[PDB]
Amino acid sequence: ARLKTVQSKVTKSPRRPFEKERLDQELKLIGTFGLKNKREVWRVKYTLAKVRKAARELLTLEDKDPKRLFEGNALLRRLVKIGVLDETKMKLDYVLGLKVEDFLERRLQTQVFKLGLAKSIHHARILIKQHHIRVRRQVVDVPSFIVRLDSQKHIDFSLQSPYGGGRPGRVKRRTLR
Amino acid sequence: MRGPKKHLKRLAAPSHWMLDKLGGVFAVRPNPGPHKLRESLPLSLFLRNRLKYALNYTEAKKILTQRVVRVDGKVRTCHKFPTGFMDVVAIERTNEYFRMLYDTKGRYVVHRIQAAEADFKLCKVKSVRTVNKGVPVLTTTDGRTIRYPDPHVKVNDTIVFNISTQKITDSVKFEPGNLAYVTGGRNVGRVGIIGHRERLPGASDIIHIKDSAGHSFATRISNVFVIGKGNKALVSLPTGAGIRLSIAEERDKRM
Amino acid sequence: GKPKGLCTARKLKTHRQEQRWNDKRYKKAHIGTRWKSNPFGGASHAKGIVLEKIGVEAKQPNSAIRKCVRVQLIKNGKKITAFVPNDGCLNFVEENDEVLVSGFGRSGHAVGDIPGVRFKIVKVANTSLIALFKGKKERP
Amino acid sequence: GISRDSWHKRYKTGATQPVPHKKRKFELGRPAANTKIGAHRVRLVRTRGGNEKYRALRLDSGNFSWASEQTTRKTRIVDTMYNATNNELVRTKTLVKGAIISVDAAPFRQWYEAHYALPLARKKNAKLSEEDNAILNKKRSHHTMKKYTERQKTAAVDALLIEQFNTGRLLARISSSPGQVGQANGYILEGKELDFYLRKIRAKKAK
RNA sequence: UACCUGAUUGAUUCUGUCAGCGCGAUAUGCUCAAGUAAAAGAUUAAGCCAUGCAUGCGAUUCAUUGAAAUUGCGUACGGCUCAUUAGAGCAGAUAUCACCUUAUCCGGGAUGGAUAACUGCGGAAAUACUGGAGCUAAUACAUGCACCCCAGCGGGGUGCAAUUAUUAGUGUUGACUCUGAAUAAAGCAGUUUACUGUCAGCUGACUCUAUCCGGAAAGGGUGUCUGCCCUUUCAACUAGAUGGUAGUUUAUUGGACUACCAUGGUUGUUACGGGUAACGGAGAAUAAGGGUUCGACUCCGGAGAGGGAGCCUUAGAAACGGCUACCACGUCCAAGGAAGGCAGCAGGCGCGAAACUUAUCCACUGUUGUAUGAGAUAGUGACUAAAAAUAUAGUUGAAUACAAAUGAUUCUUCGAGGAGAGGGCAAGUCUGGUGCCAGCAGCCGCGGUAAUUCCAGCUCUCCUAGUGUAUCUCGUUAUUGCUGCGGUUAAAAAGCUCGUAGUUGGAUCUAGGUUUACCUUGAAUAAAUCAGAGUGCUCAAUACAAGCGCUUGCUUGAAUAGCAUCAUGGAAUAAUGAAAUUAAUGGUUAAGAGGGACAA
RNA sequence: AUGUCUUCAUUAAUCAAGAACGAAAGUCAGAGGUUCGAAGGCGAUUAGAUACCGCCCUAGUUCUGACCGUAAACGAUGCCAUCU
RNA sequence: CACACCGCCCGUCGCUAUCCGGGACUGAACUGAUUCGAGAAGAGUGGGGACUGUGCGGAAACCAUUUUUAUCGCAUUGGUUUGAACCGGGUAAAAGUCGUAACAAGGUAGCUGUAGGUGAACCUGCAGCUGGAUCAUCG
RNA sequence: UCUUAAGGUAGCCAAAUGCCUCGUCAUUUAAUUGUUGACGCGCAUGAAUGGAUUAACGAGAUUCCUACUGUCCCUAACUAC
RNA sequence: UUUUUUUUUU
């Protein structure tokens, strides 16, 4: 009958629940990039850990190994398209140099306020929540949505949102009536 | 069990059929016939996936009940008919002719052919024997038996079989230097020139084949299918000419 | 020293198996009488009936009377002593009550200054002891 | 019922074997035919796959073969003489493959005389009966007599066989399984085989 | 991310465990904005079950299109569960020259009599109970339409399959008592279309039905090699047991069984016995590497249908939504009799720490395709996985979707809790009560009238729609150590020696100028899962898609990686063999190994 | 052990099962029984003194033939080879 | 020993709680095997011939026997669980009784094996060990 | 504390030895002054006046289970003398 | 020559 459904975890808990250094460093990451909870930062840590581990495992191999070649260019390609790796810095010895801040910057929430669409990062988030941003003619409502390089310059207000042309919001309509 | 099995779970279906995992619990179970279950394709699947002429499995049956599909010159109305390697499928209404061939990966494709090609097919001589009344016959790998063949035809050879006249036209001999197709194993879908033959007496002989790109590969004789004399193929081949592109070469070609 | 030859796999494997039995954890997990000896029979909790309320003198250097209760388990009829945690919670437990009992935390060993008690009460009359203590729920 | 399963036996080492399942149909057995000498009686058995077997319970006529002469005649089973397996089968007149029996010699004598046009150890003082004369003293053209003259060249018959023909009962051996095919076809003993079985029979009679 | 921290002492360094700490499974406490996927009476009781469903659809149509009934086909697949089971079962390779097959593929082969529906007469309290009387059909039932011998004038026999025997050697396979060709009888019971609808023009062409023979395919039965749990408080076991001959049975081989005969067969390289809270595998959890633990459960194989046993029908069953009996336990009786098998779906009772609606449909995947509790939908659902609101949801009517719905998606009306706060370990020596009491406290320890530890208020800390507790697995753990532990005193060298199995064994044969073992490379090697390539499901977990023009279309992806067997090459290392008419005729050296001799 | 220009030529190391030896005490049988001496009995000491101290002693201590197979049977260190 | 000799500490006895062992009772219960006795039902065979087709045929009940063999009886045996008068061991538990065994030469150095004795720790004999209170004592 | 030459040791027990006594508890039975196992301040057990065990043996004393039966319920018939 | 003990927690 029905088969097993595939599920995966995207977060790994820290080995030490209480260390002041880690707690401060993670709270600062929540601060700069407006996040919701520690799971939000552990998710990025986990993705970065996967990337770094894959790079290390490939680098254990010599330069012209078939697997090394294929997987290395694939990984570098994905990172470039996300905008996390430097398009001149095409190597795994250099992909083993990234930080959680690189990934956290490419989030839609950060770009919304970085490009001026919103004042504060919290403003960016509540706009993305209330469906006032669109990407390449698509209303994205996920503050964690990553912005590819191509999508970087094609993000503006929704064509419907009252701040992008549309029926006035509830407050305005109440006042008008 | 207590008797023959009539179902075939989707996950148990052959991988090379390339069915989708979440597309129901069952898959069309081919009927017994010319081709083996693992090395065949239901006529229902041919229309459902490879040709897209039918949206669902009621529509496949609706199409096939009209008596519009011919396999090897005979009309087939059963949606579970096991079409297999080097089978001529003719849809007269749309004037379309295909030959069921293997892709380099090892999957069935849609190879459109012309009437001249469709008039014949190749078969591998599986046995040469003498039936009652002392008359010679040869049995192919697709179940066909042909009476009164040329006495020079031996096992493992290829015979050109004319669908219209139901007669043998030519015989290509399984010897070094002839073009050969690989139907089974991990080298399925590859075409090359037969090379050395390791003669294992009580087991399956081993055949080394070198393609046009210079790549060599071995296989078992039961997976080799001669498709021409020297280097000339008696039938056409799908885009690729049985050349196994490497994984890097595939990406480079795509880009 | 241990054998090191290239053909001593059997000796190494057999010796490892022989010596694994001298390990408390392995023997405790494979002895065979675990189910018949453990009062819960390998379960985490068990329902039982309260027989009486007893007081256990705390070990030294502490001094107190821990309010425990004697319980008879329904599944096998074995008698155990369970601790009633929290302050004044022995009042909630009446005689001839159906109580859910759980382990005390150390896998069948006494905890703290309470001697010989390896179980604690979780529910009484199908009501959570914590809920009763916090006032969330009341005695049925 | 009767089973042919390999389990229920001990192992090579003498260990008791585990029973894998309940008795399966495809490993069944059936009661033995135990064919006897008597009026023809053959029952039909439905076997696996819809096929059929012929369980012969009683048989009297056997379609036996003379190998040296390369012929086959239908004679009648008279009595059972020797059985390698067990003497009880001989004493109860059981027709089983490989059993030595006594069959009528007259059909073979008739064939011999009609084929070579010569007597087969005919009696030394008795005139041939009319039916014999119809095939022995028959008169046909020399064209046909040429064929018989050619065949008379190779006509010597072994003395041990002639002695049996004198008694009129021939020692034969059953070469079929009456319980499976429903017939008792066999062949006439001759040569070293005949000497062997004759010596066995005579020794057992002497004892 | 190849990691540790607290606790024995007045203090110190160790051994060593306990405790902490991370993940997962199950249960459970408290608590839960909307949505999306999705596990779910396995654990104990393969315990017991009220009631509904879960298997039905060419020939024969004098009923009213097609009912009823007779045929034929299917119900041996599918669904469930994991009790039994330790050369059983499974995994990989491999035979069947020892076998059996419906459905599907390829070759070859216008006869007669009776029975139902129907009419009618009845019995029983009671069954899907049935006896008589009168008709009537078939795709039911029956019948069936060049060589040998005698005699070369002429007579007979010779289809396929099949029994026995014999003859010569028309193909094959590594090899055939195989397949062909002949000869002889005989019985053998199978078979070589009295079918439906027909069409075209005496000549043609189809569909259907029936039907054997040979070869395939698919399925099955057995056979071989290698691997697969604990236990010596199990060391010897085995008597149809091991083998031979002849038979019997079977579809076939076989001590499968019988008659006679021989004395064999397994075992410290662990037989035999016992245990298993034991179905095997694919796989799952944890995870530097090496591993440890588990795997009832959607896929593959096996087994069972309350426990046994026996059988009918059939191509296929030792079938149980088939029958027959016994055992245990039920049901209805008018007491004469008649019945039952949820470990199918849904529900109920028991059992327990522990698990959902007596709902809608064949629209989807499939079953030969109207029928499908298989399958698909919706219900209950803090098992679980992903994404997200509490600041800077609800609600109305449409469309869409669907088999009908629901829900999402498009529009439009109004409109925050769980643990903690001495240390480990982030966070109060704030206030009030209580005075070794009540209580807390995983561990160390708090409390004896001035408690940062109890009970409260206020404040903080961690995580957060989740957060705690209990049991268990893995890490931690070099506290099972092959990698990789330790044995003077912390636990641990046998009192000592001899000795079989086991383990391990010195150097030495082409340097220069026959076997194995081992290594390399290939072959054979189901998916799902894991790794991994591609691809804006709005992201993600997932999924396997999709992306381009312009309409009559083109091009695509759905990769690749992941013991034993066979072959290829390599000839170090480690075993193993050769010799006690000509030619160099054939014995490595003699261990700062061992044994023996001789001296004093 | 040493000496050896003797001999054999890998016959070796360690060893589950298996076997010999194995202090003292102890057991069985037969002899001996000096000394010392468990147990026992006395005299002291003591709060008591079933002990230390003193006196008289039984088994034993000794020999022969059998058992037992244990010791702080200890260098609390297994054996073989090799280097510093 | 470190609360530092007014230290620490060992046994018997007494009270409470709890776990386990032995135990007369041919104890008891559950479960699996094996021998033997009986034996349902089916299937095979030999009879039989109600009934009905043409001296011939088909055939139901029934009878006899072979085989598979459930099931029931004793009997033996393996494995689990368990009652029991009484007799004992172990452990735990703030402030019981008796003594002083050990740690200093612990006031008789301590300990090992063995044997005997005694309320209890323990004492004594024999032979060992230093883990001793001597690394030593003059030839 | 009185006191003896010594104050009954190891064992065993309501025994063929215990008055009280049909001791008390358990076992056997529906029911037991009986049996067996325990307890022991034992009127008045006890170590070659030998103590405690003990396989095999017994026309020895005792209790129970099974088989069997006219011993009995409850008697009847038959034969020889 | 004789020379036994020292409640619980802190």
Swiss-Prot record, chain A:
It holds the Pfam family Ribosomal_S4. It comes from the Eukaryota. It is found in: Cytoplasm; Nucleus, Nucleolus. Residues 160-177 are annotated as: Disordered. Belongs to the universal ribosomal protein uS4 family. This is Small ribosomal subunit protein uS4. One of its GO terms (molecular function) is rRNA binding. Component of the small ribosomal subunit. Part of the small subunit (SSU) processome, composed of more than 70 proteins and the RNA chaperone small nucleolar RNA (snoRNA) U3. One of its GO terms (cellular component) is cytosolic small ribosomal subunit. The keyword Ribosomal protein applies. Residues 106-177 form the S4 RNA-binding domain. Component of the small ribosomal subunit. The ribosome is a large ribonucleoprotein complex responsible for the synthesis of proteins in the cell. Part of the small subunit (SSU) processome, first precursor of the small eukaryotic ribosomal subunit. During the assembly of the SSU processome in the nucleolus, many ribosome biogenesis factors, an RNA chaperone and ribosomal proteins associate with the nascent pre-rRNA and work in concert to generate RNA folding, modifications, rearrangements and cleavage as well as targeted degradation of pre-ribosomal RNA by the RNA exosome. One of its GO terms (biological process) is translation. NCBIfam families: PRK04051.1, uS4_arch. Keywords: Cytoplasm, Nucleus, Ribonucleoprotein, Ribosomal protein, RNA-binding, rRNA-binding. Coiled coil: none annotated.
Swiss-Prot record, chain B:
CDD domains: KOW_RPS4. This is Small ribosomal subunit protein eS4. Signal peptide: none annotated. It comes from the Eukaryota. GO terms for molecular function: RNA binding; rRNA binding; structural constituent of ribosome. Keywords: Ribonucleoprotein, Ribosomal protein, RNA-binding, rRNA-binding. GO terms for biological process: translation. Belongs to the eukaryotic ribosomal protein eS4 family. Residues 41-100 form the S4 RNA-binding domain.
Swiss-Prot record, chain C:
It comes from the Eukaryota. It is found in: Cytoplasm, Cytosol; Cytoplasm; Rough endoplasmic reticulum. PROSITE patterns: RIBOSOMAL_S12. The keyword GTP-binding does not apply. Coiled coil: none annotated. GO terms for biological process: cytoplasmic translation; translation. One of its GO terms (molecular function) is structural constituent of ribosome. Keywords: Cytoplasm, Endoplasmic reticulum, Hydroxylation, Ribonucleoprotein, Ribosomal protein. The keyword Nucleotide-binding does not apply. The modification Hydroxyproline is found at P61. One of its GO terms (cellular component) is ribosome. Component of the 40S small ribosomal subunit. Belongs to the universal ribosomal protein uS12 family. This is Small ribosomal subunit protein uS12. It comes from Caenorhabditis elegans.
UniProtKB/Swiss-Prot annotation, chain D:
One of its GO terms (molecular function) is structural constituent of ribosome. It is found in: Cytoplasm; Membrane; Nucleus, Nucleolus. InterPro entries: Ribosomal_eS8, Ribosomal_eS8_CS, Ribosomal_Se8/biogenesis_NSA2. This is Small ribosomal subunit protein eS8. PROSITE patterns: RIBOSOMAL_S8E (PS01193). Component of the small ribosomal subunit. The ribosome is a large ribonucleoprotein complex responsible for the synthesis of proteins in the cell. Part of the small subunit (SSU) processome, first precursor of the small eukaryotic ribosomal subunit. During the assembly of the SSU processome in the nucleolus, many ribosome biogenesis factors, an RNA chaperone and ribosomal proteins associate with the nascent pre-rRNA and work in concert to generate RNA folding, modifications, rearrangements and cleavage as well as targeted degradation of pre-ribosomal RNA by the RNA exosome. Belongs to the eukaryotic ribosomal protein eS8 family. Component of the small ribosomal subunit. Identified in a IGF2BP1-dependent mRNP granule complex containing untranslated mRNAs. Part of the small subunit (SSU) processome, composed of more than 70 proteins and the RNA chaperone small nucleolar RNA (snoRNA) U3. The keyword Ribonucleoprotein applies. GO terms for cellular component: cytosolic small ribosomal subunit; membrane; nucleolus; small-subunit processome. Keywords: Cytoplasm, Lipoprotein, Membrane, Nucleus, Ribonucleoprotein, Ribosomal protein.
